[PDB]
């Protein structure tokens, strides 16, 4: 189920309570929560 809702969620000027992952090493096995945040390592000079 999905329905439009900015009249409740879009605080004017910008809402910042909503965040989503962008970079992860592995594609995500179905039905798991991966809360923890760390830093991504790309090729040489890995970053932690």
């Amino acid at each position: 189920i999905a329905w439009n809702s900015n009249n409740l969620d879009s605080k004017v000027g910008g809402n910042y309570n909503y965040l989503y992952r962008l970079f992860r090493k592995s594609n995500l096995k179905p039905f798991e929560r991966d809360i923890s945040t760390e830093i991504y390592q790309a090729g040489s000079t890995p970053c932690n």
Epitope: L8, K11, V12, G13, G14, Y16, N17, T37
Partner: antibody, heavy 122, light 108 residues
Framework: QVQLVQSGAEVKKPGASVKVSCKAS????????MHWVRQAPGQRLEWMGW????????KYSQKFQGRVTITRDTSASTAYMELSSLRSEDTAVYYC???????????????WGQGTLVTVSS | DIQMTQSPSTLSASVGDRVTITCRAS??????LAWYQQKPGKAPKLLIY???SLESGVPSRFSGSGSGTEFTLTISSLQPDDFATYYC?????????FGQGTKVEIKR
Amino acid sequence: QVQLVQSGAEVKKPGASVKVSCKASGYTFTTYAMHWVRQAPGQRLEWMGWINAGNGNTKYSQKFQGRVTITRDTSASTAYMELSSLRSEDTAVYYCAGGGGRRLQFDYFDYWGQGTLVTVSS
Amino acid sequence: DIQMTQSPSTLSASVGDRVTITCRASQSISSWLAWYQQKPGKAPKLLIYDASSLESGVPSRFSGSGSGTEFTLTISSLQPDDFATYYCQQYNGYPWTFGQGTKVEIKR
């Protein structure tokens, strides 16, 4: 219990700049939310801005745009505030607030610093 | 910008009584609000957020209500620790503002 503590009293002069800072003590830092607010004596509280103690984000006010800045130090787990071009009005008491904990951000201040006193005089 | 004004201003009471506060908004608010207690010479303490919820560690007396614009706080019995101002915070939009201040005094 999370607690916030910060610097003592200050006195400055017009045109100068001042740096107040508060140290955090929280059970986890799940994108913590140090979040500044000020109070002229006997007046309405006024809200400064919020630093994203997770990484670096720096949403600020609009009445105070272009002259106030905020940073934080990860290792010390403190929050840094900076204001310039002061003037006799900004005489106030300055506060640290924030500290959601369960979710990552709010916009309500649930952990308050014990207050910092700033006097702009000549 | 959102304006926040509280119609009651100062109020009166006596121990063991109930009080009410009104917080009106210039515009529509979707039940985004919080209520802070501030004793003189101290730091603010939060009581209610999202206009309804009761935040932990507080006496059960406090209770929020209301939606839309007119918002209300209410306590059943008036304990001594209730003797200070109370502010309402909007957080519907950007720059977040505050109220005016609503103090209560013993009446005799």
